[PDB]
Every structure is written in structure tokens, then in C-alpha cells.
């Protein structure tokens, strides 16, 4: 269980039917090219909490929850360098719905690679305990 300050790039929601971490990265690269997602997030920071329950993203004053990504519904999360030349680290989360009929992609940008990796480690430990 841990909290991190992150920025929010955006989401591609309600996709139907990306098996492979490389495929997800490529999918998002192309989505950015096609204007579905920004390349660079707005500067506004959010609080990302990671735990056994999943990932929660809240405003920086904790007054409002933006996203709740429950562990049950997380399919995979990929951490990667955005490739834009500044070494920024992204987290791309693939999630599904209660019936596992639709998928959504959520993309965040971390302050540092150390933090992105820390986030992944908590998530991986979370799955381990199941």
C-alpha cells in the first residue's frame, strides 16, 4: 500500500473484442498519433493510491476521487518510456468491466522511473496475495 503524485494523460474507453506488453505500447503510440490521447499530459497532479484493492486516483486535495481501478478488473499494466526525448515514464492500464465484455485503457505519467516501478511492484505484490 502506497501513494504517489502523478499526471493524467487520458483514456481510451469502451473498446470491444492487445495480448502482449509490446502490443499495448504500440496501440497507445498510434492512439496518440491519431488524436485519441495527448502525447503530453496536463501539468495538474493527482494522487494515485495503490493497494490490494487496486488503484485509486484522486485530486491533489483528496476531496474528489477521479478513477477507481479495482484489482478484479485490471487486466495488465505496462510501464514504459514515452519515447518523446525527456525520459518521462508512463503507466498504461488495461481494464475491463464487470462482465468482461469491454476494455478501457488509462494512461498516466509518473514523476520518475523509480516511482513508476514502485507502483508496478505494489500492484504485482497485490496479485501475488490472491
Amino acid at each position: 500500500c502506497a501513494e504517489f503524485r502523478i499526471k493524467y494523460v487520458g483514456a481510451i474507453e469502451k473498446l470491444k473484442l492487445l495480448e502482449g506488453p509490446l502490443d499495448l505500447i504500440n496501440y497507445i503510440d498510434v492512439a496518440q498519433q491519431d488524436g485519441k490521447l495527448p502525447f503530453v499530459p496536463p501539468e495538474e497532479e493527482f494522487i494515485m493510491g495503490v493497494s490490494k484493492y487496486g488503484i485509486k486516483v484522486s485530486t491533489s486535495d483528496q476531496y474528489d476521487v477521479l478513477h477507481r481501478h479495482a484489482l478484479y478488473l485490471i487486466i495488465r499494466m505496462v510501464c514504459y518510456d514515452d519515447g518523446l526525448g525527456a525520459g518521462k515514464s508512463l503507466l498504461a492500464l488495461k481494464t475491463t468491466d464487470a462482465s468482461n465484455e469491454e476494455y478501457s485503457l488509462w494512461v498516466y505519467q509518473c514523476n520518475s522511473l523509480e516511482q513508476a516501478q514502485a507502483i508496478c511492484k505494489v500492484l504485482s505484490t497485490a496479485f501475488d496475495s490472491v
Binding site: 505500447i25 503510440d29 498519433q33 485490471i74 514515452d82 519515447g83 515514464s89 500492484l123 496479485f127
Partner: peptide, 19 residues
Amino acid sequence: FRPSPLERIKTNVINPAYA
């Protein structure tokens, strides 16, 4: 444009429930 995904990937985490 940007380098290949292989050159950029750091780690991935998979939910075994859907694997």
C-alpha cells in the same frame, strides 16, 4: 518517430485471472 516499444518497456504486470 519514437524508438520501438522494445527499447522503451520497463516492466509489465499481469492479472493472472485473465491470463
